Amino acid sequence: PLTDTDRSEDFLRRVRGLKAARTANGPRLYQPITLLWAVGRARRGEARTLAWADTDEAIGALLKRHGARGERPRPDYPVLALHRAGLWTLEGHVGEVPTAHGDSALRNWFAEQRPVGGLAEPFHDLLHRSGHSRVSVIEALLTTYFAGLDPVPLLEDTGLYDEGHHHHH
DNA sequence: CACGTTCGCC
DNA sequence: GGCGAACGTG
């Protein structure tokens, strides 16, 4: 039947289908940092959704510490991309949600709308109860986004080190 | 500071 | 093209 394994391969295919903006030597880290943050919060049974102010500040902090490809603290980018992929719910806003195309209008949209948000339930609940799904998604994110980067400090800020650190010695 | 334009890429 | 994005250019 439909298992957490299949739910996990579904999530992973959806995560792999994301298209992050790319730098000269790799992908920008907005989306994996946002995903990894939600991964940790799901792992701990934290509240799925958060007001925008807390989300802005939590993801902003992770972007400033661990934005190793020149990321500026602008969670509005990854949240809109994740929302566009169906991976991130936003509520409390009026009208449709913009794409992550542009700059100041996106920042302003969150300032005015202040949407209630978080990673979508099927994946939140899945990540809360399945260590398998968490490990699998962390390793897909670290492989794709953190080649040539030290992921450990961001694994510690998300509470995922023991699931993101594979042993190789 | 804020907007319109530009870059990289499926 | 469209979107995830940064950046002149006033």
Author numbering: 2 to 170
Copied sentences from the primary study:
The sulfur atom of phosphorothioated DNA (PT-DNA) is coordinated by a surface cavity in the conserved sulfur-binding domain (SBD) of type IV restriction enzymes. The sulfur modification-dependent REases SprMcrA and ScoMcrA use an SBD to recognize the DNA backbone phosphorothioate link of the RP stereoisomer, which is adopted by the naturally occurring PT modifications in five DNA core sequence contexts in prokaryotes. The sulfur atom of the PT linkage was inserted into a cavity which formed by Y31, Q32, Y78, P79 and A82 through Van der Waals interactions; the phosphate groups flanking the PT linkage formed electrostatic bonds with R29, R73 and R85, as well as hydrogen bonds with Y31 and A101.
Crystals for SBDSpr in complex with the RP form of the 10-bp hemi-PT DNA oligonucleotide 5′-GGCGPSAACGTG-3′ were grown and obtained at 14°C with the reservoir solution containing 0.1 M BIS-Tris pH 5.5, 0.15 M ammonium acetate, and 25% PEG 3350. The structure of the SBDSpr-GPSAAC complex was refined and rebuilt using Coot and Phenix.refine. In conclusion, HGD motif formed five H-bonds in SBDSpr–GPSGCC complex while four H-bonds in SBDSpr–GPSATC and SBDSpr–GPSAAC complexes, which explained why SBDSpr showed a highest affinity for GPSGCC. What's more, close comparison of two structures revealed that the binding of the GPSAAC released the methyl group of T6′ on the complementary strand from the binding site, and converts the weak non-bonded interaction to unfavored thymine methyl-solvent accessibility. In the case of GPSAAC, the T6′ methyl group was fully exposed to solvent and lack of specific interaction with SBD protein.
